[PDB]
């Protein structure tokens, strides 16, 4: 139950290929033109 | 003879044998003492006689 | 058209106008070296010499007598504390052919 050997830099960088953050679901707000998250209330204006 | 060109008498001096410095010297690992036994230990050997 | 010559310990196929590399010779820069050991003159007129084709010589200008690139011989035997590093550089000659005979 211990690592029998090192994980080389190649293996490391390989495993984390799919480890990333997604760009937010952002759309432009119709009253102010600033971006907002879709289905959420704009925090700059306060609309829909 | 000048002090900056001096030479020692031919064959009068010889560089001593440093032991335990690399394999290429021929006395590298065991320092010429074989592998094991008293001879291979520090302060080893046996009393004469 | 193409001649085959025997120099040093090997054979080379040659047509006038080419640069070649052979073992070291004893001639100097810019000189002319003529080979007398020709074994086959081919192309439009073929002459197959039994051992050698009698008469056909091959003359070439000499240039750039030099030393090959340094191959570094290294060998070791594991666990036996034994190794050897030597360096080597074969000498050679650059010859340019300028004429052929038949």
């Amino acid at each position: 139950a211990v690592p029998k050997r090192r994980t080389s830099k190649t293996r490391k960088n390989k495993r984390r290929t799919h480890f990333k953050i997604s760009v937010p679901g952002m759309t432009e707000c119709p009253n102010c033109g600033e971006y907002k998250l879709s289905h959420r209330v704009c925090k700059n204006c306060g609309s829909y | 003879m000048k002090l900056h060109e001096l030479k020692p008498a031919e064959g009068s001096r010889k560089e001593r044998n440093r032991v335990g410095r690399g394999v290429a010297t021929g006395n590298g690992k065991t320092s010429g003492r074989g592998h094991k036994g008293q001879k291979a230990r520090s302060g080893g050997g046996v009393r004469p006689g | 058209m193409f001649a085959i010559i025997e120099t040093g310990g090997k054979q080379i196929k040659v047509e006038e106008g080419q640069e070649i590399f052979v073992e070291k010779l004893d001639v100097n820069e810019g000189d002319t070296f003529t080979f007398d050991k020709v074994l086959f003159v081919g192309g439009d007129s073929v002459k197959v010499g039994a051992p050698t084709v009698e008469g056909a010589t091959v003359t070439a200008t000499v240039n750039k007598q030099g030393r090959g690139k340094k191959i570094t011989v290294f060998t070791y035997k594991r666990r036996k504390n034994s190794k050897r590093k030597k360096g080597h550089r074969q000498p050679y000659t650059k010859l340019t052919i300028d004429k052929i005979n038949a």
Binding site: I21, V23, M26, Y35 | - | -
Partner: protein, 112 residues
């Protein structure tokens, strides 16, 4: 041409800051700001401020107006780590490396 802005010894481990910077690499200034302000991660407020400084730097020092700016390149690399310990079981102590980050952002007009 290029405006610079750097934040040093930020108290966030560099593996964690780089996850957010892998989004604003090569995007426009407005879109980049909208990403940061809406990405719900810890490093995001601290980067939105390094970007802000660069952009201000651009306007105040080069007359490089912000409507045409793009994060030319933006990265983060390690900083002076702070070493601490956690009292674990059976008298043994394990180490905790509180890391840091040297955040860099450069925005360009794409021009010369």
């Amino acid at each position: 041409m290029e405006a610079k802005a750097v934040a040093r010894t930020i108290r966030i481990a560099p593996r964690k800051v780089r996850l957010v910077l892998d989004l604003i690499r090569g995007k426009n200034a407005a879109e980049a700001i909208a990403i940061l302000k809406l990405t719900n991660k810890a490093s995001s407020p601290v980067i939105e401020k390094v970007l802000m400084s660069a952009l201000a730097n651009a306007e105040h020092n080069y007359d490089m107006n912000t409507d045409e700016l793009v994060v030319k390149e933006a990265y983060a690399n390690e900083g002076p780590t702070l070493k601490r310990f956690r009292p674990r079981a059976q008298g043994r102590a394990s180490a905790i490396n509180k890391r840091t980050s040297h955040i860099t952002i450069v925005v360009s007009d794409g021009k010369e």
